[PDB]
Amino acid sequence: GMKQEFVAAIEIDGTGRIHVTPGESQFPYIYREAMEVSWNESTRSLHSPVPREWSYAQWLQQIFAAASEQGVKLVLGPNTRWVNVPNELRAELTHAAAA
Amino acid sequence: QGMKQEFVAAIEIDGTGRIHVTPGESQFPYIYREAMEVSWNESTRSLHSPVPREWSYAQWLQQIFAAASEQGVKLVLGPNTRWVNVPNELRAELTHAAAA
Numbered sequence: 001g002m003k004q005e006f007v008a009a010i011e012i013d014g015t016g017r018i019h020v021t022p023g024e025s026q027f028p029y030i031y032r033e034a035m036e037v038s039w040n041e042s043t044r045s046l047h048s049p050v051p052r053e054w055s056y057a058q059w060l061q062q063i064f065a066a067a068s069e070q071g072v073k074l075v076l077g078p079n080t081r082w083v084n085v086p087n088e089l090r091a092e093l094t095h096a097a098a099a
Numbered sequence: 100q101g102m103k104q105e106f107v108a109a110i111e112i113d114g115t116g117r118i119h120v121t122p123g124e125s126q127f128p129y130i131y132r133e134a135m136e137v138s139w140n141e142s143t144r145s146l147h148s149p150v151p152r153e154w155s156y157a158q159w160l161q162q163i164f165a166a167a168s169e170q171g172v173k174l175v176l177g178p179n180t181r182w183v184n185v186p187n188e189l190r191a192e193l194t195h196a197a198a199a
Contacts, residue, residue: 011183
């Protein structure tokens with residue numbers, strides 16, 4: 001049950017987000033799709049997040065931060081097992097878990 | 100305060116490239132509720148990330164078109180399509196990404 005529609009504009013804003021402005025439709029609730037697409041009303045555009053390349057280090061900290069929100073401070077031990085983590089990365093990750 | 104310190108039993112990057120943190124004892128069934136893009140996999144009892152991925156404008160355009168399509172609108176680029184601050188090459192690549 002679709003419906004074809006022309007895009008009025010494609011734009012990259014000053015923060016690097018890409019905006020697609022629909023020919024006519026509005027999507028105030030595009031967030032409910034859980035696809036990290038947002039709606040900016042002032043410009044009636046669907047847009048991406050600010051460009052982001054997340055390292056494993058940053059994801060590790062994110063995972064730690066989430067567990068912390070639920071009352072658990074995770075720490076690495078001398079017995080923690082590292083599985084399929086290159087040596088160079090392990091160092092970086094270990095530093096991440098502490099920083 | 101109620102904050103419990105705990106050992107990590109394992110760090111693992113799986114076959115799909117997600118990084119897994121296996122807590123020593125705690126479980127986090129509702130971790131998704133923190134809205135932080137972290138998930139709990141009960142079969143492996145681990146917190147994990149999504150699959151890694153580089154930033155790509157083409158992909159993001161496709162992602163944007165895909166979100167719109169879920170809400171019943173198939174977007175298409177036209178000859179009258181206005182491009183603001185989109186460099187020549189990116190503009191070509193974005194055009195092709197919208198076609199494929």
